[PDB]
Structure 1
Amino acid sequence: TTISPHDAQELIARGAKLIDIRDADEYLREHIPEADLAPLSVLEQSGLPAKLRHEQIIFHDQAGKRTSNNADKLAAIAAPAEIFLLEDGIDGWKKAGLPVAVN
């Protein structure tokens, strides 16, 4: 499932997790305030920690390419949650006029 930025906001308001799968350097330069960072490589090595698990998990990346290309991996990493992918990543979030945090 892909989810629009405005629809993701709605889910986050009901406690859904938003997971940034980018690297810490990317995150530090610009991120979504409500997102929790967990780079894909780390998730692949040691899985999703309990603190980031929820009924509803939304992954995001830069532009939607990384989540689309790693959809099966993300689906198992977050199982058995209801899992979504942020349409066009943070770039999508920006295009929808939602706030970001720039260093």
Structure 2
Amino acid sequence: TTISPHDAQELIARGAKLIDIRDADEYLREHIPEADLAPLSVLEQSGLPAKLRHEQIIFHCQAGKRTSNNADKLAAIAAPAEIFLLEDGIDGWKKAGLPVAVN
């Protein structure tokens, strides 16, 4: 299930985790302040750590392609949470006028 940036904001205000699945270099260049970084490759190897588990988990990437194409992996990695993919990724978040942190 996709979630709009504004709807994601409301879930994050209720404790939902926003997980950036990009690499550290991409995150360091520009990221969402509320996000926790966990690159997809790391999640595929060692799973979601306990500190990033919650009743609601929202994954995001750059523009919605990496979440869309790895939907099955992500659904397992965060199970049994209620899981969302941020619509159009950080690009969508920016287009909605929500804050990012730029290096």
| TM > 0.5 | yes
Distance 2:16 2:45 in 1: 23
Amino-acid identity (%): 99
Distance 1:6 1:39 in 2: 23
User: For structure 1, which runs of at least 5 residues remain unmatched after alignment?
Assistant: none
Distance 2:49 2:82 in 1: 16
Alpha-carbon deviations, 1:72-101, whole Å to 9, x = none?
000000000000000000000000000000
Q: How does 1:61-100 map to 2 (within 5 A)?
A: 61-100=61-100
* TM-score, normalised with respect to structure 2: 1.00
Q: Secondary structure at the match of 2:33?
A: coil
Q: Secondary structure at the match of 2:54?
A: coil
Q: Secondary structure at the match of 1:22?
A: coil
User: For structure 2, which runs of at least 5 residues remain unmatched after alignment?
Assistant: none
In the TM superposition, residue 19 of structure 1 has moved relative to its aligned partner by 0.0
Q: Secondary structure at the match of 1:62?
A: coil
4+ residue runs over 2 A deviation: none
Aligned-residue RMSD, C-alpha: 0.1
Distance 1:43 1:59 in 2: 12
In the TM superposition, residue 63 of structure 1 has moved relative to its aligned partner by 0.2
* TM-score, normalised with respect to structure 1: 1.00
In the TM superposition, residue 45 of structure 1 has moved relative to its aligned partner by 0.2
Distance 2:82 2:65 in 1: 20
Alpha-carbon deviations, 1:51-76, whole Å to 9, x = none?
00000000000000000000000000
Alpha-carbon deviations, 1:16-49, whole Å to 9, x = none?
0000000000000000000000000000000000
Where does residue 47 of structure 1 map in the other structure? 47
Aligned length: 103
In the TM superposition, residue 11 of structure 1 has moved relative to its aligned partner by 0.1
